[PDB]
C-alpha cells in the first residue's frame, strides 16, 4: 500500500497547551452513539469514563442511564441485563468493522518529508485528522478512471489508502492513479443526521470534526493529565538545570 493526503483540521487539543472541549466531546459521543456504534465498538473504553474529568465529563446519573441502552452478557449470571457504567462499550456490531477504541492513535496522517518523519515532528501523527478526512472523503461521483469498474460493496474514498483499486486505475507499474481507494464502509454521514440539543450545526463537516475529537479522547483519555504532568516536569528540570549549571560553573571555575 502506501500513504496519502489528510485535511489538516485545527483541533482544540493539539499543541502543548491544548485541551479537549467538553461540549465537542459530548456532541461527538452523540454521533458515535447515534451513527457509528451501529457497526463499530469501543471494547477498551469503560463507559464510566464518560464521567471522569478531562473528557466529556457527564453526570454519573446520565452515564448510568446511558449505559442502560446496551445489553451485556453478565460475567457470572450469563443471562443478560441493562448496562452499568462499569461495563465497556460493546465490541463492534459489524464483524469487519474495526474497533474505534484506539483509532486516533492507530493512524498516521502526516508522513515524511522524504520519509524523514519531519512532517510528524511539527504536525503530530494526525490520527484524528485522518479519521476526519475519511469521514469527509466520500465523494458523490467515483473518479472517471473507474467509471464502470467499482467493486461491489465498496466505495471510493479520497483519504483511505489501503483499499483495493480497479486495474483500470493503476499506472504502467501497478501503482494507483486515484488519490484514495475503495473502502468497505458505506458513507455514514449525511448533513443533519443528528439533532444537537443546543442546535449546533450538524453539517457533515462538523459532525466528523467532533466525533473525531471524541474518538481522540476515547483513545487518549488521560491526555490532559499527561500534558499537565509535562509542564511540571519541564519546570522542575528547567530550574534544576539552571541551578545545577551555576553550581557546576562555580565548582569548576575553581580549577580553570
Amino acid at each position: 500500500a502506501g500513504g496519502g493526503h489528510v485535511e489538516d483540521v485545527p483541533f482544540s487539543f493539539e499543541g502543548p497547551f491544548g485541551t479537549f472541549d467538553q461540549h465537542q466531546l459530548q456532541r461527538g459521543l452523540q454521533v458515535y452513539t447515534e451513527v457509528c456504534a451501529a457497526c463499530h465498538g469501543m471494547k477498551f473504553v469503560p463507559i464510566r469514563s464518560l464521567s471522569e474529568p478531562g473528557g466529556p465529563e457527564l453526570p454519573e446519573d446520565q452515564v448510568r442511564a446511558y449505559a442502560t441502552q446496551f445489553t451485556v452478557t453478565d460475567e457470572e449470571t450469563g443471562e443478560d441485563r441493562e448496562g452499568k457504567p462499569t461495563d465497556h462499550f460493546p465490541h463492534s456490531a459489524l464483524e469487519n468493522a474495526p474497533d474505534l477504541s484506539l483509532m486516533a492513535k492507530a493512524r498516521a496522517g502526516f508522513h515524511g518529508p522524504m520519509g524523514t518523519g519531519i512532517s510528524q515532528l511539527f504536525n503530530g501523527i494526525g490520527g484524528p485528522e485522518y479519521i476526519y478526512s475519511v469521514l469527509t472523503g466520500f465523494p458523490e461521483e467515483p473518479p472517471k478512471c473507474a467509471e464502470g469498474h467499482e467493486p461491489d460493496g465498496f466505495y471510493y474514498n479520497r483519504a483511505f489508502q489501503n483499499g483495493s483499486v480497479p486495474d483500470t486505475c493503476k499506472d504502467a507499474n501497478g501503482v494507483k492513479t486515484t488519490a484514495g481507494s475503495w473502502i468497505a464502509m458505506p458513507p455514514p454521514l449525511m448533513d443533519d443526521l443528528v439533532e444537537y440539543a443546543d442546535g449546533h450545526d450538524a453539517s457533515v463537516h462538523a459532525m466528523a470534526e467532533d466525533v473525531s475529537a471524541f474518538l481522540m479522547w476515547a483513545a487518549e483519555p488521560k491526555l490532559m493529565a499527561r500534558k499537565q504532568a509535562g509542564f511540571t516536569a519541564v519546570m522542575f528540570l528547567t530550574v534544576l538545570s539552571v541551578l545545577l549549571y551555576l553550581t557546576n560553573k562555580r565548582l569548576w571555575a575553581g580549577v580553570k
Binding site: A1, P16, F44, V45, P46, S49, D99, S101, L102, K105, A106, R107, A108, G115, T116, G117, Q120, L121, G124, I125, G127, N162, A219, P221, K222, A225, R226, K227, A229, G230, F231, A233, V234, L237, T238, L240, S241, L244, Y245, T247, N248, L251, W252, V255, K256
Partner: protein, 428 residues
C-alpha cells in the same frame, strides 16, 4: 593505577564498620578516583545510560504489577494500565520512550569510543563487556516490544524467531524451541515475559564489571594520553577527584537530558513509535507498513540489502554449494556487522590512541557515522530503487571500515603530534 589516597574512618561508627565490612571504603575509592581534567561532554553518556537502566527497571517492576502475560489479556492488560492504574499512562510511556533514550545513548556512547580509541588497549576488556551489554540490551528491548501483543509485536516476534530458523541444520530445531511450538503463540509470549524480566538484572551485573574494568585502567580522555603515574604530585596536575567535580557535571547534564526526555514523554510520547502497535495482534495479517524500531533500523537495513540477486550473495551461494543462500547470508551479514565492531580493538592497527590526531582516520570515521545514520534512514524506506542500492553501498562501507580501512590506515597514515600531557591540553 594512578596515585592517590584511600578513605580513613573518622566517626566511631565508621571505625567500627570499617574493621568489619569496609563497604564504605569501597564506595569511597569508587567515587574518589582521579579523573582526567579535559573530559568533555561526550563522557556524560555513560551516566545517561546508568540512569536509563534504573529508570527502566523501576518503571518495569511497576508495570509488571499490572501486566498480564497471556494473549487473551496482555493487550487489554496494557490499555488497562493506560486508562486505570494511577499514573499508568505516564509509566507506560516512560518505560517505552525509556528504551529509545537508552539506545540514543549507547550509540553516542559507542561512537564516542570508536572516535577516541577508548577500545584500543589496555581498554579491551571494557569494550568487550560493553558489547555484551549491547547485545543483552537489544535482546531485552525486543522481548519487551513483544509484550503489548500488538501488530508490530506479533510479527516482529515471528521474524526475530525466524532469524534462528536461518541457521543451517539445527536452525528449525532452535526455532521451534524458542517458539515453544509451531507458531508464535502464548507459549512464546509467556517465556518472553520471564526473560524480559530476567535480562535487565544480568545487564546490571555486567554494567558492574564494565565499571570495575574501566576503573582498573583509569578513564580515557580526548587526547588519548594517559595520566602520569609517577607521583601524586604530577598526577593531580593531570586530574581532579571524581567527586564532586564530575559527579556534578553528571548530575548537571543528567538534568538537561531529562528535561528534553520528559518534554517528549509529556508532549509527544508516540512520536518514536509505530502506530500499528495500537492494533491488536492478528495472526492472519501482516500490516503493510510493518517497520522495526528505529533503534534497530540500521541492522535491519543491512539484513535486507542482501537479496538473492546480489553478486556477492551468488558468488557465496555458489562457493558454498547452496548452503549459504540469501536468507542466511542476510542473517550473517547482520550479526556480522555487529561482530566486526566487537573485534575493532584488533582491526585497528594504528598505535595512536585518540582519533583527534589521525587526519585520514577522521574522514572514514565521520563517513561511518554518516553511514549509520543513512543506514537507519533507509531501513525506513521501501525495497525499491534507489534504496536497494543505497542500502547496499551503505552496508558495503560498513564492513569496509572495520575489515579494511582501519587495518590499512594503521600502516599508511602519518599521525599528528599528541600533547605530552593532559595538563598541557587542559591549560590550553
Amino acid at each position: 593505577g594512578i596515585p592517590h589516597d584511600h578513605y580513613e574512618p573518622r566517626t566511631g561508627i565508621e571505625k567500627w564498620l570499617h574493621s568489619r565490612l569496609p563497604i564504605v571504603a569501597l564506595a569511597y575509592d569508587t567515587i574518589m578516583i582521579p579523573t582526567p581534567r579535559n573530559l568533555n561532554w561526550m563522557w556524560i553518556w555513560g551516566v545517561v545510560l546508568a540512569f536509563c537502566l534504573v529508570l527502566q527497571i523501576v518503571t518495569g517492576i511497576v508495570l509488571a504489577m499490572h501486566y498480564t502475560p497471556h494473549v487473551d489479556l496482555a493487550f487489554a492488560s496494557v490499555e488497562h494500565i493506560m486508562r486505570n492504574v494511577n499514573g499508568g499512562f505516564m509509566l507506560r510511556y516512560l518505560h517505552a520512550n525509556g528504551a529509545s533514550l537508552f539506545f540514543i545513548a549507547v550509540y553516542l556512547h559507542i561512537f564516542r569510543g570508536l572516535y577516541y580509541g577508548s577500545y584500543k588497549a589496555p581498554r579491551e576488556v571494557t569494550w568487550i563487556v560493553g558489547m555484551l551489554i549491547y547485545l543483552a540490551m537489544m535482546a531485552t528491548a525486543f522481548m519487551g516490544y513483544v509484550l503489548p501483543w500488538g501488530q508490530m509485536s506479533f510479527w516482529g516476534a515471528t521474524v526475530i524467531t525466524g532469524l534462528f530458523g536461518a541457521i543451517p541444520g539445527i536452525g528449525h530445531s532452535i526455532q521451534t524451541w524458542l517458539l515453544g511450538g509451531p507458531a508464535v503463540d502464548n507459549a512464546t509470549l509467556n517465556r518472553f515475559f520471564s526473560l524480559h524480566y530476567l535480562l535487565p538484572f544480568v545487564i546490571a551485573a555486567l554494567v558492574a564489571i564494565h565499571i570495575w574494568a574501566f576503573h582498573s585502567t583509569g578513564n580515557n580522555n580526548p587526547t588519548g594520553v594517559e595520566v602520569r603515574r609517577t607521583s601524586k604530585a604530577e598526577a593531580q596536575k593531570d586530574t581532579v577527584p571524581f567527586w564532586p567535580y564530575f559527579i556534578i557535571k553528571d548530575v548537571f547534564a543528567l538534568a538537561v537530558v531529562l528535561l528534553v526526555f520528559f518534554a517528549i514523554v509529556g508532549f509527544m510520547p508516540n512520536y518514536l513509535g509505530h502506530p500499528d502497535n495500537y492494533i491488536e495482534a492478528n495472526p492472519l495479517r501482516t500490516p503493510a507498513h510493518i517497520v522495526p524500531e528505529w533503534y534497530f533500523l540500521p541492522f535491519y537495513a543491512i539484513l535486507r540489502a542482501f537479496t538473492a540477486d546480489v553478486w556477492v550473495v551468488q558468488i557465496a551461494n555458489f562457493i558454498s554449494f547452496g548452503i549459504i543462500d540469501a536468507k542466511f547470508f542476510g542473517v550473517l551479514a547482520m550479526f556480522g556487522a555487529i561482530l566486526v565492531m566487537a573485534l575493532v580493538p584488533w582491526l585497528d592497527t594504528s598505535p595512536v590512541r585518540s582519533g583527534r590526531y589521525r587526519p585520514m582516520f577522521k574522514i572514514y570515521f565521520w563517513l561511518l557515522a554518516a553511514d549509520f545514520v543513512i543506514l537507519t534512514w533507509v531501513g525506513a524506506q521501501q525495497t525499491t530503487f534507489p534504496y536497494d542500492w543505497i542500502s547496499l553501498i551503505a552496508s558495503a562501507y560498513w564492513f569496509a571500515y572495520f575489515l579494511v580501512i582501519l587495518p590499512i590506515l594503521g600502516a599508511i597514515e602519518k599521525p599528528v603530534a599528541p600533547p605530552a600531557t593532559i595538563e598541557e591540553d587542559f591549560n590550553a
